Write a protein that binds this ligand. Structure first.
Ligand SMILES: [C]C1=[C]C([C])=[N+]2C1=C([C][C][C][C][C][C][C][C][C][C]C(=O)O[C][C]([O])[C][O])C1=C([C])[C]=C([C])N1[B]2(F)F
Length: 137
């Protein structure tokens, strides 16, 4: 599987409204979240990954070894905890977050320097795109 290490700048998103509602995020917080352009930073070493979502209001970091289910602390996101498993399906990094919310998870994949992210919760599907930042001193 590919190595996903990189810093990727926000490009676009669609239907984040839907995903936020599906996680039961309040109107006040959804209004804030829809204004921001969070970046994605990944540290992928061997079979271990750290994935950071970075914004001026709040950051969220998760760590994992691919293939090992773990308790994901999402209390800073939607107040919940999940039993989360990340796998590789061809070149897609697939995450299933098992818990209260059905169909919860996400999928990354790369096309050149564009990093795609699909986010799901209940019947909501959000599509995001990021672009890798080149290491220019
Ligand atoms: C400010 C605030 C507050 C709060 C609470 N909020 C916000 C916002 C904005 C800011 C940002 C934060 C971070 C998040 C993370 C998760 C997703 C990604 C992910 O999943 O990823 C995936 C891979 O890549 C790893 O992980 C938001 C959004 C945009 C969304 C959401 C849900 N939100 B929330 F409701 F949490």
């Amino acid at each position: 599987p590919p190595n996903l290490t990189g810093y990727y700048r926000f490009v676009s998103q669609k239907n984040m409204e839907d995903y936020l509602q599906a996680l039961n995020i309040s109107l006040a917080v959804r209004k804030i979240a829809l204004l921001l352009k969070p970046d994605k930073e990944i540290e992928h070493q061997g079979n271990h990954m750290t994935v950071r979502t970075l914004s001026t209001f709040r950051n969220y970091t998760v760590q994992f070894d691919v293939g090992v289910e773990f308790e994901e602390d999402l209390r800073s996101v939607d107040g919940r905890k999940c039993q989360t498993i990340v796998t590789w399906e061809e070149e897609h990094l697939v995450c299933v977050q098992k818990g209260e919310v059905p169909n919860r998870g996400w999928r990354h994949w790369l096309e050149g320097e564009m990093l795609y992210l699909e986010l799901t919760a209940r019947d909501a599907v959000c599509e995001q795109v990021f672009r890798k930042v080149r290491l220019v001193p």
